Amino acid sequence: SNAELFNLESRVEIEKSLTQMEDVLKALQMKLWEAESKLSFATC
Amino acid sequence: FNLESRVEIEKSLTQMEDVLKALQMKLWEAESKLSFAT
Amino acid sequence: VPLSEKIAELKEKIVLTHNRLKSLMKILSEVTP
């Protein structure tokens, strides 16, 4: 079944970039947090 | 990705918004690949 | 279908983080004219 194969190739490349998006955003969330603390302390 | 100065926070916050904007398209792309593989 | 749920959980976080970023952009422009 090339269908079942195609399905599996999809689900692989899908959840790969899902983890990728996970890693990109949670670094983003960490620098966001730094900026929040910066402007928070600055404007008291 | 600097926070030394207000001008750099501004630049850095827009970069983060541009990054999220790329993430939202990647999420949608994943939504559709998945919907097409069921 | 766990992939379906990983999509939805990831979507809501993009949104929440996007909202934090929005609120911080308004606070930052009150002090950077």
Residue numbers in the entry:
A (entry chain B): 188 to 231
B (entry chain A): 193 to 230
C (entry chain C): 190 to 222
Give excerpts from the publication:
To preserve centromere identity, CENP-A levels must be maintained through active CENP-A loading during the cell cycle. A central player mediating this process is the Mis18 complex (Mis18α, Mis18ý and Mis18BP1), which recruits the CENP-A specific chaperone HJURP to centromeres for CENP-A deposition. Here, using a multi-pronged approach, we characterise the structure of the Mis18 complex and show that multiple hetero- and homo-oligomeric interfaces facilitate the hetero-octameric Mis18 complex assembly composed of 4 Mis18α, 2 Mis18ý and 2 Mis18BP1.
We purified Mis18α spanning aa residues 191 to 233 and Mis18ý spanning aa residues 188 and 229 ([Fig fig1]**, S1a & b**) and crystallised the reconstituted complex. The two Mis18α helices interact in an antiparallel orientation, and one helix is stabilised in a slightly curved conformation. This arrangement results in a predominantly negatively charged groove that runs diagonally on the surface formed by the Mis18α helices ([Fig fig1] **& e**). In contrast, the pI of the Mis18ý helix is 8.32. It should be noted that the crystal structure presented here differs from the previously predicted models in terms of either the subunit stoichiometry or the directional arrangement of individual subunits (Mis18α and Mis18ý in parallel orientation with the 2^nd^ Mis18α in an anti-parallel orientation (this work) vs all parallel).
